[PDB]
Paper text:
Here we present cryo-electron microscopy structures of the kainate receptor GluK2 in the presence of the agonist glutamate and the positive allosteric modulators lectin concanavalin A and BPAM344.
Particles representing GluK2 with no ConA bound yielded two structures, GluK2Glu-4fold, which has a nearly four-fold symmetrical LBD layer, and an apparently asymmetric structure, GluK2Glu-asym. Both structures revealed Glu but not BPAM molecules bound to the LBDs, despite incubation of the sample with saturating BPAM concentration. Indeed, the D1–D1 interface in the A–D LBD dimer of GluK2Glu-asym undergoes rupture, resulting in marked separation of the D1 lobes compared with GluK2BPAM and GluK2Glu–ConA–BPAM. This rupture of the interface that harbours BPAM molecules in GluK2BPAM and GluK2Glu–ConA–BPAM distorts BPAM binding sites and explains why this PAM is not bound to the GluK2Glu-asym A–D LBD dimer. The pores in Glu-bound GluK2Glu-4fold and GluK2Glu-asym appear to be non-conducting, consistent with these being desensitized ionotropic glutamate receptors. These structures might represent different stages of desensitization, with GluK2Glu-asym being an intermediate state.
Residue numbers in the entry:
A (entry chain A): 97 to 240
B (entry chain B): 33 to 480
C (entry chain D): 241 to 288
Write the structure that this text describes.
Amino acid sequence: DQLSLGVAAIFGPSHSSSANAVQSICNALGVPHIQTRWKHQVSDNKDSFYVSLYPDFSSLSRAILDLVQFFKWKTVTVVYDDSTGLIRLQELIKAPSRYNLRLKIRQLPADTKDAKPLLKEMKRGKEFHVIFDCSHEMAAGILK
Amino acid sequence: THVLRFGGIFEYVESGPMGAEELAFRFAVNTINRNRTLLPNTTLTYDTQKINLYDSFEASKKACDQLSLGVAAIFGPSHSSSANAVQSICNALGVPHIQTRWKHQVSDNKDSFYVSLYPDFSSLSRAILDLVQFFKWKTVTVVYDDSTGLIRLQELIKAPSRYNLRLKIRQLPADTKDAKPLLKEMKRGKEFHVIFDCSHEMAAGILKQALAMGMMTEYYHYIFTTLDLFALDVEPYRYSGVNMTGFRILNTENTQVSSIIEKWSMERLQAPPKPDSGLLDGFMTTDAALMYDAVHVVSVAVQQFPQMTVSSLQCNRHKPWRFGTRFMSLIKEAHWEGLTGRITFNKTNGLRTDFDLDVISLKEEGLEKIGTWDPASGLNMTESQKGKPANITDSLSNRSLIVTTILEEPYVLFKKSDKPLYGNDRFEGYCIDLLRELSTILGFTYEI
Amino acid sequence: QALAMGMMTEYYHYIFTTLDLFALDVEPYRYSGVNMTGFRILNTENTQ
Ligand SMILES: *[C@@H]1O[C@H](CO)[C@@H](O[C@@H]2O[C@H](CO)[C@@H](O)[C@H](O)[C@H]2NC(C)=O)[C@H](O)[C@H]1NC(C)=O
Ligand SMILES: *[C@@H]1O[C@H](CO)[C@@H](O)[C@H](O)[C@H]1NC(C)=O
Ligand SMILES: *[C@@H]1O[C@H](CO)[C@@H](O)[C@H](O)[C@H]1NC(C)=O
Ligand SMILES: *[C@@H]1O[C@H](CO)[C@@H](O)[C@H](O)[C@H]1NC(C)=O
Ligand SMILES: *[C@@H]1O[C@H](CO)[C@@H](O)[C@H](O)[C@H]1NC(C)=O
């Protein structure tokens, strides 16, 4: 209803699923789709009518790896919120092949904010080098 | 009396005859119409049409064309991006969206009208986890194929906190099947345990290169994930001694099932697989298994519910259909038995969490059941406990080995705690050790 | 048939005897790690 109305620069949703609909809209008709949040590429899609200005997790997940090298850690305890977030960290999970990192990946609980049992388990496990991976609205609630 | 029009979306078969899911779907429409036991006074029909699996707009046109034609259930495409297009069609109108493919589920995707008969990796990866306590490993080296691999095994990747392991997750190279630089690093890593996680087509492709990389010894103890492990031409690997354990859902231990599978392979004499692939020729893929198991589950639903019919609803004017709010509650409450055995959905989210499995492994004769898994019960595995054969403890070399014993200190002093006990520990000392120290070397159950 | 019975590791070493070992289809075995040290009298390292 914007395309039949006549537009030039669809700027897309901010979500995974509703993006890939409007991208394949924008592949057929020819209008550029322009994204803002990172979505999950399916790696075999022939779509090239899209750009995405979210900083790609190809390089962010690599940049985190260099910054854990810098601190010379051994016992990182990677924590995410949604299963998409594990894909957002692939250069860190593949690292124990390369280096002597020893991850222990553990998940913020579903349908809630309650990060007590995480931190309950996290204290007794004696880990101290934890990487979070969650939205900043979520993230402030853990530190509370 | 009524036709109850089905259809849906399938793979485009650019110059080949037909894709293997679509053959099962027409074979499912056939089989119910012959056997009149299922479905009184009705028949079934289908409107199949193809997409490129990556063009959701092609799917969203071709879905709503069948909706404008009027269907009774869209049976959906077979790809993640093309699912969520047709997923959101069936949420909008109320028609069901019976799937045969695991897709990524968005965590906040508030939908109702869909099921997916492919067993959830929420449960399935607990089963792969259930083996590595049974096989008593420590040093798993999970190998995914693309970025959706590492999201499937999330219950496996969240292991090493407990059941203690040491995960070294590494990735198959994209854009090729050249796993030689990948496997060469695994050899110098001494990584003798690995949970290959890909299709069966890749699972032939790595082994056939892992055979040339000298990785197929009696040391290496592969575990696959694909539910068509019983479709590999395992014949060249069979004598070597490789322990490629795995899974299947497709129960070949039923006459009625295996009759269909050979009735199938006569129908799909059309489209033979090319020989050098490393794959077999006559085999039910587990996708075409779930596709044929799907239409039964819908057919047993309309058995449970008459008077269901076809209206023609239009995506241009968003309107809830009529019957789906009744009828989706029929589908989600189903307990059909089929090619995958106990189809039973989940009264929560429309997945498949309860299902039975066989654990098949490569013994020297071939693939062979070594037990049964389900969400309860853990690994019920018929180990057929060794140390039996026609014997107990050699029965004459170890009769009771009755030993003439005097109590003398420090040789045999006396073993007391309180409250008179028995066995060989009625006495203790230097010779009582030399009883068991001569027994620890050779092996004989002795008696004072 | 050594390959189909998993004896083509990095541990084995098969000295062949025949004087045609060079003319053998060594391509699937090559990457593995057997060291099939054999012989040749044929002198293919000479242009004429
Ligand atoms: C790895 O494989 C060997 C043989 O491939 C396993 O040994 C078993 O050996 C008996 C002979 O006494 C055979 O009859 C069985 O069929 C073999 N079992 C299997 C599953 O192949 C050995 O137990 C395996 N070990 C590990 C750690 O996987
Ligand atoms: C039709 O299916 C039913 C199962 O509901 C079975 O009992 C019956 O034997 C089948 N008919 C034939 C001819 O196989
Ligand atoms: C339809 O099937 C029913 C059984 O449910 C049977 O009684 C009836 O004779 C059949 N035919 C018609 C025309 O209704
Ligand atoms: C339904 O799905 C949830 C989420 O996976 C699962 O925990 C639950 O046990 C399922 N219900 C049944 C009947 O098992
Ligand atoms: C499964 O059940 C018990 C152990 O759970 C065992 O006795 C039985 O033999 C197993 N197998 C079958 C086919 O019931």
